mmCIF file of N, CA and C in Angstrom:
data_model
loop_
_atom_site.group_PDB
_atom_site.id
_atom_site.type_symbol
_atom_site.label_atom_id
_atom_site.label_comp_id
_atom_site.label_asym_id
_atom_site.label_seq_id
_atom_site.Cartn_x
_atom_site.Cartn_y
_atom_site.Cartn_z
ATOM 1 N N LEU A 1 110.099 92.146 119.533
ATOM 2 C CA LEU A 1 111.567 91.815 119.395
ATOM 3 C C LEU A 1 112.274 92.588 118.222
ATOM 4 N N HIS A 2 112.539 91.891 117.116
ATOM 5 C CA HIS A 2 112.936 92.566 115.903
ATOM 6 C C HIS A 2 111.791 93.601 115.598
ATOM 7 N N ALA A 3 110.554 93.090 115.570
ATOM 8 C CA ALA A 3 109.289 93.859 115.561
ATOM 9 C C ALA A 3 109.225 95.258 116.270
ATOM 10 N N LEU A 4 109.609 95.378 117.547
ATOM 11 C CA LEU A 4 109.524 96.707 118.198
ATOM 12 C C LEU A 4 110.556 97.667 117.620
ATOM 13 N N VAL A 5 111.639 97.116 117.134
ATOM 14 C CA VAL A 5 112.693 97.953 116.664
ATOM 15 C C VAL A 5 112.382 98.329 115.248
ATOM 16 N N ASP A 6 111.757 97.406 114.536
ATOM 17 C CA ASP A 6 111.140 97.661 113.234
ATOM 18 C C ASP A 6 110.075 98.751 113.321
ATOM 19 N N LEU A 7 109.181 98.652 114.301
ATOM 20 C CA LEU A 7 108.183 99.683 114.607
ATOM 21 C C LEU A 7 108.856 100.990 114.803
ATOM 22 N N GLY A 8 109.914 100.905 115.604
ATOM 23 C CA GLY A 8 110.616 102.088 116.069
ATOM 24 C C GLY A 8 111.120 102.854 114.922
ATOM 25 N N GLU A 9 111.812 102.171 114.006
ATOM 26 C CA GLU A 9 112.420 102.902 112.878
ATOM 27 C C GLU A 9 111.406 103.393 111.850
ATOM 28 N N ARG A 10 110.282 102.670 111.677
ATOM 29 C CA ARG A 10 109.176 103.144 110.847
ATOM 30 C C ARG A 10 108.729 104.580 111.321
ATOM 31 N N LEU A 11 108.478 104.742 112.602
ATOM 32 C CA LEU A 11 108.273 106.095 113.274
ATOM 33 C C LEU A 11 109.223 107.238 112.845
ATOM 34 N N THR A 12 110.483 106.908 112.637
ATOM 35 C CA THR A 12 111.587 107.818 112.310
ATOM 36 C C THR A 12 111.393 108.312 110.903
ATOM 37 N N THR A 13 110.401 107.739 110.240
ATOM 38 C CA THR A 13 110.149 107.953 108.805
ATOM 39 C C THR A 13 108.886 108.828 108.593
ATOM 40 N N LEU A 14 108.154 109.107 109.690
ATOM 41 C CA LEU A 14 106.882 109.835 109.588
ATOM 42 C C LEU A 14 106.985 111.349 109.710
ATOM 43 N N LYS A 15 106.112 112.019 108.976
ATOM 44 C CA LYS A 15 105.832 113.500 109.209
ATOM 45 C C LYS A 15 105.318 113.836 110.598
ATOM 46 N N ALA A 16 105.779 114.946 111.161
ATOM 47 C CA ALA A 16 105.574 115.289 112.585
ATOM 48 C C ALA A 16 104.090 115.496 112.901
ATOM 49 N N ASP A 17 103.400 116.009 111.914
ATOM 50 C CA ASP A 17 102.009 115.954 111.671
ATOM 51 C C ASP A 17 101.286 114.675 112.101
ATOM 52 N N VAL A 18 101.781 113.547 111.619
ATOM 53 C CA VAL A 18 101.225 112.242 111.889
ATOM 54 C C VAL A 18 101.638 111.908 113.312
ATOM 55 N N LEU A 19 102.935 112.001 113.649
ATOM 56 C CA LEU A 19 103.462 111.722 114.997
ATOM 57 C C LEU A 19 102.750 112.464 116.052
ATOM 58 N N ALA A 20 102.390 113.731 115.790
ATOM 59 C CA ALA A 20 101.672 114.563 116.798
ATOM 60 C C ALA A 20 100.325 113.942 117.194
ATOM 61 N N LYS A 21 99.728 113.088 116.335
ATOM 62 C CA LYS A 21 98.439 112.364 116.597
ATOM 63 C C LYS A 21 98.639 111.023 117.347
ATOM 64 N N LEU A 22 99.872 110.477 117.331
ATOM 65 C CA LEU A 22 100.231 109.219 118.025
ATOM 66 C C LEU A 22 100.483 109.425 119.529
ATOM 67 N N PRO A 23 100.160 108.416 120.364
ATOM 68 C CA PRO A 23 100.440 108.589 121.812
ATOM 69 C C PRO A 23 101.866 108.185 122.329
ATOM 70 N N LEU A 24 102.861 108.991 121.930
ATOM 71 C CA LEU A 24 104.234 108.769 122.302
ATOM 72 C C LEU A 24 104.582 109.509 123.559
ATOM 73 N N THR A 25 105.253 108.813 124.480
ATOM 74 C CA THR A 25 105.984 109.484 125.564
ATOM 75 C C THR A 25 106.897 110.652 125.045
ATOM 76 N N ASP A 26 107.143 111.677 125.858
ATOM 77 C CA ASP A 26 108.134 112.736 125.644
ATOM 78 C C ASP A 26 109.502 112.101 125.320
ATOM 79 N N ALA A 27 109.871 111.052 126.042
ATOM 80 C CA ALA A 27 111.175 110.473 125.741
ATOM 81 C C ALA A 27 111.230 109.958 124.294
ATOM 82 N N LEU A 28 110.141 109.406 123.773
ATOM 83 C CA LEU A 28 110.121 108.994 122.379
ATOM 84 C C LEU A 28 110.135 110.151 121.422
ATOM 85 N N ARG A 29 109.265 111.107 121.627
ATOM 86 C CA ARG A 29 109.261 112.279 120.771
ATOM 87 C C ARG A 29 110.718 112.858 120.660
ATOM 88 N N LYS A 30 111.430 112.917 121.804
ATOM 89 C CA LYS A 30 112.767 113.445 121.836
ATOM 90 C C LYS A 30 113.715 112.534 121.036
ATOM 91 N N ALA A 31 113.760 111.229 121.379
ATOM 92 C CA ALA A 31 114.577 110.248 120.657
ATOM 93 C C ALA A 31 114.346 110.380 119.193
ATOM 94 N N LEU A 32 113.096 110.618 118.815
ATOM 95 C CA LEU A 32 112.741 110.674 117.414
ATOM 96 C C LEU A 32 113.178 111.979 116.708
ATOM 97 N N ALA A 33 113.270 113.106 117.429
ATOM 98 C CA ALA A 33 113.688 114.352 116.789
ATOM 99 C C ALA A 33 115.221 114.348 116.693
ATOM 100 N N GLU A 34 115.771 113.589 117.607
ATOM 101 C CA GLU A 34 117.187 113.534 117.715
ATOM 102 C C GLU A 34 117.702 112.582 116.591
ATOM 103 N N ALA A 35 116.839 111.680 116.070
ATOM 104 C CA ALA A 35 117.328 110.550 115.239
ATOM 105 C C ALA A 35 118.230 110.944 114.035
ATOM 106 N N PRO A 36 117.837 111.952 113.227
ATOM 107 C CA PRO A 36 118.729 112.269 112.098
ATOM 108 C C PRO A 36 120.115 112.803 112.446
ATOM 109 N N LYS A 37 120.350 113.249 113.708
ATOM 110 C CA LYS A 37 121.728 113.592 114.132
ATOM 111 C C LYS A 37 122.623 112.349 114.205
ATOM 112 N N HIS A 38 122.040 111.159 114.258
ATOM 113 C CA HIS A 38 122.895 109.963 114.174
ATOM 114 C C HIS A 38 123.066 109.483 112.718
ATOM 115 N N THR A 39 124.233 109.826 112.181
ATOM 116 C CA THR A 39 124.818 109.536 110.869
ATOM 117 C C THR A 39 125.677 108.205 110.883
ATOM 118 N N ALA A 40 126.624 108.084 111.839
ATOM 119 C CA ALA A 40 127.545 106.921 111.914
ATOM 120 C C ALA A 40 126.788 105.604 112.090
ATOM 121 N N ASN A 41 127.399 104.502 111.645
ATOM 122 C CA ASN A 41 126.753 103.179 111.725
ATOM 123 C C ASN A 41 126.465 102.809 113.176
ATOM 124 N N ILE A 42 127.450 103.074 114.018
ATOM 125 C CA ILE A 42 127.370 102.726 115.411
ATOM 126 C C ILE A 42 126.363 103.627 116.148
ATOM 127 N N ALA A 43 126.330 104.915 115.762
ATOM 128 C CA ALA A 43 125.468 105.918 116.377
ATOM 129 C C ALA A 43 124.043 105.579 116.041
ATOM 130 N N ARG A 44 123.814 105.287 114.751
ATOM 131 C CA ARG A 44 122.475 104.976 114.266
ATOM 132 C C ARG A 44 121.915 103.695 114.914
ATOM 133 N N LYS A 45 122.663 102.573 114.863
ATOM 134 C CA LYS A 45 122.226 101.316 115.468
ATOM 135 C C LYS A 45 121.900 101.447 116.950
ATOM 136 N N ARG A 46 122.773 102.150 117.678
ATOM 137 C CA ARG A 46 122.543 102.431 119.097
ATOM 138 C C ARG A 46 121.205 103.150 119.277
ATOM 139 N N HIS A 47 121.122 104.365 118.757
ATOM 140 C CA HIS A 47 119.855 105.081 118.753
ATOM 141 C C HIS A 47 118.616 104.267 118.321
ATOM 142 N N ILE A 48 118.662 103.420 117.300
ATOM 143 C CA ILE A 48 117.436 102.660 117.029
ATOM 144 C C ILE A 48 117.159 101.505 118.039
ATOM 145 N N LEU A 49 118.187 100.950 118.648
ATOM 146 C CA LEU A 49 117.927 100.014 119.725
ATOM 147 C C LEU A 49 117.377 100.721 120.924
ATOM 148 N N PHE A 50 117.994 101.826 121.252
ATOM 149 C CA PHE A 50 117.476 102.674 122.289
ATOM 150 C C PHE A 50 115.989 103.055 121.972
ATOM 151 N N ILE A 51 115.698 103.389 120.722
ATOM 152 C CA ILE A 51 114.299 103.611 120.326
ATOM 153 C C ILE A 51 113.430 102.352 120.547
ATOM 154 N N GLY A 52 113.936 101.217 120.044
ATOM 155 C CA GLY A 52 113.470 99.875 120.429
ATOM 156 C C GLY A 52 113.122 99.731 121.900
ATOM 157 N N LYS A 53 114.090 99.943 122.809
ATOM 158 C CA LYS A 53 113.828 99.802 124.272
ATOM 159 C C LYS A 53 112.704 100.748 124.696
ATOM 160 N N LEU A 54 112.643 101.884 124.046
ATOM 161 C CA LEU A 54 111.772 102.950 124.456
ATOM 162 C C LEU A 54 110.331 102.643 124.087
ATOM 163 N N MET A 55 110.154 101.891 123.023
ATOM 164 C CA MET A 55 108.847 101.426 122.569
ATOM 165 C C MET A 55 108.031 100.708 123.662
ATOM 166 N N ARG A 56 108.763 100.146 124.620
ATOM 167 C CA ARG A 56 108.163 99.331 125.677
ATOM 168 C C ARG A 56 107.398 100.236 126.657
ATOM 169 N N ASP A 57 107.542 101.561 126.517
ATOM 170 C CA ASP A 57 106.817 102.486 127.414
ATOM 171 C C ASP A 57 105.542 102.968 126.747
ATOM 172 N N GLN A 58 105.400 102.594 125.467
ATOM 173 C CA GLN A 58 104.279 103.005 124.649
ATOM 174 C C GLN A 58 103.133 101.986 124.584
ATOM 175 N N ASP A 59 102.016 102.546 124.172
ATOM 176 C CA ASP A 59 100.863 101.813 123.815
ATOM 177 C C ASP A 59 101.066 101.350 122.339
ATOM 178 N N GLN A 60 101.639 100.166 122.184
ATOM 179 C CA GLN A 60 102.018 99.642 120.914
ATOM 180 C C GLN A 60 100.810 99.331 120.050
ATOM 181 N N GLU A 61 99.763 98.808 120.669
ATOM 182 C CA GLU A 61 98.538 98.513 119.957
ATOM 183 C C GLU A 61 97.973 99.779 119.332
ATOM 184 N N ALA A 62 97.916 100.885 120.093
ATOM 185 C CA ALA A 62 97.426 102.198 119.606
ATOM 186 C C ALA A 62 98.294 102.693 118.501
ATOM 187 N N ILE A 63 99.601 102.603 118.678
ATOM 188 C CA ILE A 63 100.514 103.034 117.613
ATOM 189 C C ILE A 63 100.284 102.205 116.320
ATOM 190 N N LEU A 64 100.289 100.875 116.455
ATOM 191 C CA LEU A 64 100.002 99.959 115.342
ATOM 192 C C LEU A 64 98.660 100.185 114.632
ATOM 193 N N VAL A 65 97.648 100.564 115.411
ATOM 194 C CA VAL A 65 96.333 100.768 114.849
ATOM 195 C C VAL A 65 96.353 102.004 113.933
ATOM 196 N N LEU A 66 96.956 103.087 114.453
ATOM 197 C CA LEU A 66 97.102 104.323 113.686
ATOM 198 C C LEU A 66 98.000 104.236 112.436
ATOM 199 N N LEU A 67 99.121 103.529 112.539
ATOM 200 C CA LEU A 67 99.873 103.130 111.323
ATOM 201 C C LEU A 67 99.130 102.240 110.305
ATOM 202 N N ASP A 68 98.314 101.305 110.796
ATOM 203 C CA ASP A 68 97.450 100.542 109.876
ATOM 204 C C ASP A 68 96.522 101.512 109.161
ATOM 205 N N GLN A 69 95.903 102.470 109.843
ATOM 206 C CA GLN A 69 95.071 103.487 109.165
ATOM 207 C C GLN A 69 95.773 104.271 108.088
ATOM 208 N N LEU A 70 96.986 104.715 108.394
ATOM 209 C CA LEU A 70 97.846 105.401 107.382
ATOM 210 C C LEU A 70 98.212 104.465 106.234
ATOM 211 N N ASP A 71 98.570 103.230 106.482
ATOM 212 C CA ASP A 71 98.942 102.364 105.302
ATOM 213 C C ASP A 71 97.754 101.979 104.430
ATOM 214 N N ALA A 72 96.580 101.896 105.078
ATOM 215 C CA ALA A 72 95.316 101.526 104.450
ATOM 216 C C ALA A 72 94.879 102.689 103.546
ATOM 217 N N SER A 73 95.147 103.915 103.996
ATOM 218 C CA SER A 73 94.668 105.024 103.220
ATOM 219 C C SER A 73 95.707 105.182 102.068
ATOM 220 N N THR A 74 96.947 104.779 102.281
ATOM 221 C CA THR A 74 97.803 104.797 101.106
ATOM 222 C C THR A 74 97.525 103.576 100.152
ATOM 223 N N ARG A 75 97.018 102.458 100.701
ATOM 224 C CA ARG A 75 96.584 101.378 99.820
ATOM 225 C C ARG A 75 95.440 101.828 98.959
ATOM 226 N N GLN A 76 94.484 102.525 99.545
ATOM 227 C CA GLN A 76 93.316 102.933 98.851
ATOM 228 C C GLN A 76 93.713 103.966 97.791
ATOM 229 N N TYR A 77 94.652 104.810 98.110
ATOM 230 C CA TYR A 77 95.186 105.710 97.110
ATOM 231 C C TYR A 77 95.732 104.932 95.912
ATOM 232 N N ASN A 78 96.582 103.972 96.202
ATOM 233 C CA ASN A 78 97.254 103.178 95.152
ATOM 234 C C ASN A 78 96.283 102.401 94.311
ATOM 235 N N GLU A 79 95.268 101.762 94.903
ATOM 236 C CA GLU A 79 94.222 101.100 94.122
ATOM 237 C C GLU A 79 93.626 102.145 93.074
ATOM 238 N N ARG A 80 93.313 103.371 93.512
ATOM 239 C CA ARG A 80 92.570 104.292 92.639
ATOM 240 C C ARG A 80 93.572 104.783 91.596
ATOM 241 N N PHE A 81 94.814 104.969 92.008
ATOM 242 C CA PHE A 81 95.897 105.382 91.057
ATOM 243 C C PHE A 81 96.093 104.354 89.950
ATOM 244 N N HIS A 82 96.288 103.089 90.308
ATOM 245 C CA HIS A 82 96.470 102.095 89.233
ATOM 246 C C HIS A 82 95.178 101.917 88.395
ATOM 247 N N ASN A 83 93.971 102.057 89.009
ATOM 248 C CA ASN A 83 92.731 101.933 88.255
ATOM 249 C C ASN A 83 92.694 102.983 87.107
ATOM 250 N N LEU A 84 92.966 104.207 87.509
ATOM 251 C CA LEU A 84 93.178 105.340 86.576
ATOM 252 C C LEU A 84 94.336 105.122 85.512
ATOM 253 N N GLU A 85 95.458 104.505 85.909
ATOM 254 C CA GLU A 85 96.423 104.230 84.874
ATOM 255 C C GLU A 85 95.918 103.195 83.800
ATOM 256 N N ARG A 86 95.159 102.192 84.261
ATOM 257 C CA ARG A 86 94.410 101.265 83.374
ATOM 258 C C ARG A 86 93.349 101.931 82.532
ATOM 259 N N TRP A 87 92.471 102.756 83.118
ATOM 260 C CA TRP A 87 91.613 103.562 82.284
ATOM 261 C C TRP A 87 92.284 104.406 81.155
ATOM 262 N N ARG A 88 93.357 105.115 81.485
ATOM 263 C CA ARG A 88 94.155 105.878 80.525
ATOM 264 C C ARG A 88 94.654 105.003 79.419
ATOM 265 N N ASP A 89 95.365 103.943 79.749
ATOM 266 C CA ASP A 89 95.816 103.042 78.693
ATOM 267 C C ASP A 89 94.661 102.403 77.844
ATOM 268 N N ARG A 90 93.636 101.914 78.494
ATOM 269 C CA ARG A 90 92.470 101.469 77.760
ATOM 270 C C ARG A 90 91.795 102.477 76.816
ATOM 271 N N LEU A 91 91.590 103.712 77.267
ATOM 272 C CA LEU A 91 91.056 104.653 76.383
ATOM 273 C C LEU A 91 92.011 104.958 75.150
ATOM 274 N N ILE A 92 93.333 105.135 75.338
ATOM 275 C CA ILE A 92 94.224 105.443 74.303
ATOM 276 C C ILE A 92 94.259 104.254 73.314
ATOM 277 N N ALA A 93 94.508 103.031 73.796
ATOM 278 C CA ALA A 93 94.393 101.839 72.955
ATOM 279 C C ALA A 93 93.023 101.424 72.332
ATOM 280 N N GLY A 94 91.900 102.040 72.652
ATOM 281 C CA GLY A 94 90.648 101.417 72.303
ATOM 282 C C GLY A 94 89.874 102.367 71.464
ATOM 283 N N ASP A 95 88.589 102.447 71.674
ATOM 284 C CA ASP A 95 87.753 103.221 70.761
ATOM 285 C C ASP A 95 86.537 103.792 71.527
ATOM 286 N N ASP A 96 85.505 104.169 70.817
ATOM 287 C CA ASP A 96 84.354 104.724 71.447
ATOM 288 C C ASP A 96 83.597 103.831 72.479
ATOM 289 N N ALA A 97 83.679 102.498 72.350
ATOM 290 C CA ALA A 97 83.064 101.605 73.278
ATOM 291 C C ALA A 97 83.713 101.780 74.635
ATOM 292 N N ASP A 98 85.025 102.007 74.675
ATOM 293 C CA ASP A 98 85.691 102.242 75.944
ATOM 294 C C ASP A 98 85.449 103.609 76.540
ATOM 295 N N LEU A 99 85.448 104.653 75.713
ATOM 296 C CA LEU A 99 84.942 105.951 76.142
ATOM 297 C C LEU A 99 83.590 105.848 76.865
ATOM 298 N N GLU A 100 82.622 105.107 76.290
ATOM 299 C CA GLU A 100 81.305 104.930 76.878
ATOM 300 C C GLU A 100 81.284 104.261 78.211
ATOM 301 N N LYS A 101 82.086 103.199 78.350
ATOM 302 C CA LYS A 101 82.265 102.509 79.614
ATOM 303 C C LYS A 101 82.855 103.483 80.601
ATOM 304 N N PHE A 102 83.840 104.284 80.194
ATOM 305 C CA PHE A 102 84.469 105.235 81.114
ATOM 306 C C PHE A 102 83.519 106.287 81.703
ATOM 307 N N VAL A 103 82.655 106.786 80.836
ATOM 308 C CA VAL A 103 81.713 107.834 81.172
ATOM 309 C C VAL A 103 80.538 107.221 81.964
ATOM 310 N N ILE A 104 80.260 105.909 81.807
ATOM 311 C CA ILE A 104 79.300 105.349 82.704
ATOM 312 C C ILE A 104 79.829 105.300 84.194
ATOM 313 N N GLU A 105 81.103 105.058 84.359
ATOM 314 C CA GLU A 105 81.747 105.046 85.664
ATOM 315 C C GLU A 105 81.944 106.525 86.163
ATOM 316 N N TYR A 106 82.149 107.480 85.232
ATOM 317 C CA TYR A 106 82.323 108.936 85.521
ATOM 318 C C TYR A 106 81.318 109.840 84.690
ATOM 319 N N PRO A 107 80.015 109.817 85.009
ATOM 320 C CA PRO A 107 78.945 110.414 84.139
ATOM 321 C C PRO A 107 78.991 111.934 84.068
ATOM 322 N N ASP A 108 79.858 112.502 84.911
ATOM 323 C CA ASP A 108 80.208 113.957 84.798
ATOM 324 C C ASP A 108 81.441 114.304 83.888
ATOM 325 N N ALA A 109 82.111 113.303 83.332
ATOM 326 C CA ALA A 109 83.117 113.548 82.328
ATOM 327 C C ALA A 109 82.559 114.427 81.188
ATOM 328 N N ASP A 110 83.382 115.410 80.747
ATOM 329 C CA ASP A 110 83.177 116.158 79.523
ATOM 330 C C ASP A 110 83.632 115.253 78.392
ATOM 331 N N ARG A 111 82.673 114.793 77.612
ATOM 332 C CA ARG A 111 82.833 113.700 76.648
ATOM 333 C C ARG A 111 83.592 114.211 75.426
ATOM 334 N N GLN A 112 83.363 115.469 75.137
ATOM 335 C CA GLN A 112 83.924 116.086 73.964
ATOM 336 C C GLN A 112 85.401 116.412 74.266
ATOM 337 N N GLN A 113 85.723 116.819 75.482
ATOM 338 C CA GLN A 113 87.105 117.128 75.783
ATOM 339 C C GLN A 113 87.898 115.860 75.927
ATOM 340 N N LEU A 114 87.342 114.831 76.547
ATOM 341 C CA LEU A 114 88.014 113.506 76.589
ATOM 342 C C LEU A 114 88.271 112.893 75.213
ATOM 343 N N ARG A 115 87.259 112.916 74.328
ATOM 344 C CA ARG A 115 87.317 112.469 72.950
ATOM 345 C C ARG A 115 88.445 113.151 72.130
ATOM 346 N N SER A 116 88.487 114.449 72.230
ATOM 347 C CA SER A 116 89.529 115.302 71.723
ATOM 348 C C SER A 116 90.915 114.950 72.259
ATOM 349 N N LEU A 117 91.034 114.757 73.570
ATOM 350 C CA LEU A 117 92.250 114.273 74.230
ATOM 351 C C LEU A 117 92.692 112.897 73.684
ATOM 352 N N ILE A 118 91.773 111.933 73.623
ATOM 353 C CA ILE A 118 92.045 110.586 73.109
ATOM 354 C C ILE A 118 92.574 110.583 71.680
ATOM 355 N N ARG A 119 91.889 111.232 70.767
ATOM 356 C CA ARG A 119 92.333 111.451 69.410
ATOM 357 C C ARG A 119 93.774 111.955 69.323
ATOM 358 N N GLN A 120 94.099 112.986 70.075
ATOM 359 C CA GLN A 120 95.422 113.626 70.018
ATOM 360 C C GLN A 120 96.476 112.619 70.560
ATOM 361 N N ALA A 121 96.195 111.863 71.635
ATOM 362 C CA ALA A 121 97.099 110.869 72.174
ATOM 363 C C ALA A 121 97.277 109.632 71.295
ATOM 364 N N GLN A 122 96.187 109.171 70.649
ATOM 365 C CA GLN A 122 96.258 108.115 69.602
ATOM 366 C C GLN A 122 97.153 108.593 68.462
ATOM 367 N N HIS A 123 96.956 109.791 67.968
ATOM 368 C CA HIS A 123 97.833 110.352 66.942
ATOM 369 C C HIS A 123 99.318 110.357 67.410
ATOM 370 N N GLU A 124 99.602 110.781 68.633
ATOM 371 C CA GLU A 124 100.995 110.863 69.075
ATOM 372 C C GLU A 124 101.573 109.482 69.194
ATOM 373 N N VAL A 125 100.784 108.528 69.675
ATOM 374 C CA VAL A 125 101.109 107.100 69.536
ATOM 375 C C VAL A 125 101.453 106.654 68.154
ATOM 376 N N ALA A 126 100.611 107.010 67.167
ATOM 377 C CA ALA A 126 100.665 106.389 65.837
ATOM 378 C C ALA A 126 101.811 106.992 65.117
ATOM 379 N N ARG A 127 102.039 108.281 65.412
ATOM 380 C CA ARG A 127 103.035 109.058 64.636
ATOM 381 C C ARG A 127 104.289 109.071 65.468
ATOM 382 N N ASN A 128 104.283 108.362 66.623
ATOM 383 C CA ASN A 128 105.518 108.173 67.466
ATOM 384 C C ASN A 128 106.088 109.552 67.864
ATOM 385 N N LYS A 129 105.231 110.364 68.481
ATOM 386 C CA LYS A 129 105.588 111.606 69.163
ATOM 387 C C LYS A 129 105.813 111.357 70.659
ATOM 388 N N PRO A 130 106.541 112.287 71.383
ATOM 389 C CA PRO A 130 106.449 112.319 72.857
ATOM 390 C C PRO A 130 105.016 112.132 73.259
ATOM 391 N N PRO A 131 104.750 111.140 74.071
ATOM 392 C CA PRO A 131 103.347 110.986 74.474
ATOM 393 C C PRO A 131 102.772 111.990 75.518
ATOM 394 N N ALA A 132 102.760 113.281 75.178
ATOM 395 C CA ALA A 132 102.300 114.357 76.114
ATOM 396 C C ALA A 132 100.842 114.331 76.469
ATOM 397 N N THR A 133 100.002 114.014 75.488
ATOM 398 C CA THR A 133 98.581 114.071 75.708
ATOM 399 C C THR A 133 98.095 112.945 76.617
ATOM 400 N N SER A 134 98.835 111.848 76.677
ATOM 401 C CA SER A 134 98.478 110.767 77.595
ATOM 402 C C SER A 134 98.634 111.181 79.032
ATOM 403 N N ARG A 135 99.765 111.790 79.379
ATOM 404 C CA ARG A 135 99.881 112.574 80.646
ATOM 405 C C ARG A 135 98.693 113.537 80.957
ATOM 406 N N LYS A 136 98.180 114.272 79.938
ATOM 407 C CA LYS A 136 96.978 115.157 80.102
ATOM 408 C C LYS A 136 95.737 114.339 80.414
ATOM 409 N N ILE A 137 95.554 113.227 79.729
ATOM 410 C CA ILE A 137 94.434 112.348 80.018
ATOM 411 C C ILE A 137 94.525 111.833 81.499
ATOM 412 N N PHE A 138 95.682 111.288 81.908
ATOM 413 C CA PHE A 138 95.863 110.833 83.270
ATOM 414 C C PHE A 138 95.510 111.957 84.227
ATOM 415 N N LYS A 139 95.983 113.150 83.924
ATOM 416 C CA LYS A 139 95.652 114.331 84.758
ATOM 417 C C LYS A 139 94.131 114.614 84.888
ATOM 418 N N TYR A 140 93.442 114.599 83.729
ATOM 419 C CA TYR A 140 92.021 114.961 83.652
ATOM 420 C C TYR A 140 91.222 113.869 84.355
ATOM 421 N N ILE A 141 91.566 112.601 84.113
ATOM 422 C CA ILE A 141 90.815 111.572 84.843
ATOM 423 C C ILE A 141 91.013 111.559 86.407
ATOM 424 N N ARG A 142 92.227 111.932 86.855
ATOM 425 C CA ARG A 142 92.559 112.032 88.210
ATOM 426 C C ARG A 142 91.672 113.092 88.824
ATOM 427 N N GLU A 143 91.465 114.186 88.077
ATOM 428 C CA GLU A 143 90.542 115.280 88.472
ATOM 429 C C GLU A 143 89.129 114.789 88.624
ATOM 430 N N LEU A 144 88.612 114.051 87.651
ATOM 431 C CA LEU A 144 87.288 113.349 87.802
ATOM 432 C C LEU A 144 87.151 112.397 89.034
ATOM 433 N N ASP A 145 88.176 111.597 89.334
ATOM 434 C CA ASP A 145 88.238 110.680 90.512
ATOM 435 C C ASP A 145 88.494 111.395 91.789
ATOM 436 N N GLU A 146 88.905 112.651 91.662
ATOM 437 C CA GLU A 146 89.375 113.507 92.728
ATOM 438 C C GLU A 146 90.591 112.879 93.379
ATOM 439 N N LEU A 147 91.432 112.204 92.597
ATOM 440 C CA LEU A 147 92.656 111.687 93.175
ATOM 441 C C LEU A 147 93.651 112.843 93.391
ATOM 442 N N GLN A 148 93.722 113.250 94.652
ATOM 443 C CA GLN A 148 94.251 114.520 95.103
ATOM 444 C C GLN A 148 95.689 114.903 94.706
#
């Protein structure tokens, strides 16, 4: 109901890349390429209801399953992203005990370069500089996690 039209407009938001893997009728693919030509309130609402009606020709379960895969892989991204933001803040706020915990989770970390990074970011904290080195730490740890 509201749901199919909600589905419908979520589609209008995807890279063609992703859409090319979904099992959409030609009429949907067309409705969907046409969608940004509808600017006006009336034009847009019409087109998304029409997209709504068109959903009924699709395999909704298949579409939903593939969107769940995409949202799940962005959830997993976000979990690793926030984990890394916590590691960064913990290392800058803490001391060698936290460095050690970090390197146990990432035993390929260069300990001397991280230590050097931490020192410089603690200093910028303490001396109230632009916190540039904290951005470098987030970067270097993202590289260790392979957060792409």
